[PDB]
Amino acid sequence: PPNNSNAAEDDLPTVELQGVVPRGVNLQEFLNVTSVHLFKERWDTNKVDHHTDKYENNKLIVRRGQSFYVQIDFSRPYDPRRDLFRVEYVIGRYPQENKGTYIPVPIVSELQSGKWGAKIVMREDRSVRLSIQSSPKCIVGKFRMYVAVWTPYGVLRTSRNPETDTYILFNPWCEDDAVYLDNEKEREEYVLNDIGVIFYGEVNDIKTRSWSYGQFEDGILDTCLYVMDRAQMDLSGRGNPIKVSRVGSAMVNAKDDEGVLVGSWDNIYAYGVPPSAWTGSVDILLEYRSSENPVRYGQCWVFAGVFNTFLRCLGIPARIVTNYFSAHDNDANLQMDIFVNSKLTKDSVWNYHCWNEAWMTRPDLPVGFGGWQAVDSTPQENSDGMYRCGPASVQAIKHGHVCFQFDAPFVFAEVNSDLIYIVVENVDATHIGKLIVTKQIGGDGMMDITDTYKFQEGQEEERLALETALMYGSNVDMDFEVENAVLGKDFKLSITFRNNSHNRYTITAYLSANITFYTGVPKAEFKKETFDVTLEPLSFKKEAVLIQAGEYMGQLLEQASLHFFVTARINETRDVLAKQKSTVLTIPEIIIKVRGTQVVGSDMTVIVEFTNPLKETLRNVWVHLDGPGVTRPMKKMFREIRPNSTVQWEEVCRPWVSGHRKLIASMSSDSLRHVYGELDVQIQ
């Protein structure tokens, strides 16, 4: 029986006796709770540190994967020799522990990374203060809180108390959260800013509409939970931002599901509010909850505004993007078919259309396709039987890898379909998607983001990416490998073509090399090349692309990978061959050891060891040792380090600062450069 309503609740017993308990049992032996404090004022550290102090809501609101403080007052002081209790968080009418909807929180000695637990951080008289840590994959919603005391006769639990109901939201500040955004200014704009601007008009007459998202106003968070209940969205999926944003794209429009907003373009808007009269999302959302029926009426920017409120309210970073000359493909062939024969012609173009982007990893897609995902709640085309759209990886759209779910071919057509005047009379390859914009961070100005959706018009890559997309919808094989790729060195990208036919072919291709975060979120393109090659019959040809250290070393970060796209067209047949692969750079190690006591004022020897990882000789090797408070900076030069050879460097020093210190070593030579090692040291 589906647990698909946050509003519904089950009734947990307060005296949960087990077996045939004898008359005359004395339960006074056991702890009972006299009071629970959540420290939930909007000035206190829970709501401030969780960035939830702005909600007009008197209950505790926290973000998942981050700890918060509560205090439990007991009937006598908690004594771990004789007493055992746990906190419980419960959601829905049919909670189940294996579905994440009944959450036991054990009292533990030390919090464990990523795991639910509560640590006692203070005991005074009858009270214990707990640091409670939630899982960064926690279901998002409004949970009921209980304290459960375990006895030989069963569990004794606190009564239902709506005043301790606790909202747990997505956490863009938590590095283990799927919606993690590592930039504070972007978090303020895309999560915490409750007003914004939606661009409209025409390419050469750009206008701006202010919009009040109002995600912190009284009732709005509860309405967003209500929207998911009205979707009959299983609670177990509400911790997954892919599922939340996709449900949101269906539910913000009224089609199919009694969603929030009824679309109309008829210039009359009978018995409703005309789409151009709204100036924000709050009135719409609150009317949906109070009337429990769709609100009339909206168009693209109103849908986007309300969808933006939904996403930001729940904690998914989100923004509104505007596409000038936005194509509406009606037959999913990824082009505008213009016959004007108004009866045969179904496809159309809007002066502008706008939709939302929501920020998240895509663990269902290969690494490289996380980050901004296009989601669209304006009804246009059905997606798997419902008016919804996305999340579509913007990075997948750019390279035409529209095979990756969801609805990427449609969004591609919106931003870059060709106009085909049809016998084919004429082709316009540059009209659709002339400019794509979103509000800038920290101002009302316009940010051009066209380049995130597509390559520049006129460039060969824009052609090659479009043919890839149409292919995803000659007897030549294409593959590529990265030859022995070591951090700090140039390396080769080897593209091989195998021609099994008797035909001579010409090939036009591009290469895109990108840095990617460990979670699969794209960071930056650092190399882009187009090239042409001739392919003799019955032959194999390898095309080696040199990737110099300078091209990527400036944009790396911890556990980053490299993401390569290669797309080649066989010109005589127009066949497309498109591959994408990621690789992790082999990382040279530098080992730091310390010998002797590490006391502030006595001498300790630091040993820096480095092994040449290459089959080539390193020359003019500079090793540096850094360690504020531990050593003045020092340097060692090695003229030559032979292949697979190890050098060792001993450096005496006397620390000037006690406590947890750090040693950092660096190595740079004429080829391999900027490889590091580190060691934490405690200085007694």
Binding site: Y200, G201, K207, W265, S276, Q299, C300, W301, F325, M336, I338, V340, T345, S348, V349, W350, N351, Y352, H353, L419
Partner: peptide, 7 residues
């Protein structure tokens, strides 16, 4: 101000 622009 969405409007379909005729071809």
């Amino acid at each position: 101000x969405x409007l379909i622009l005729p071809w």
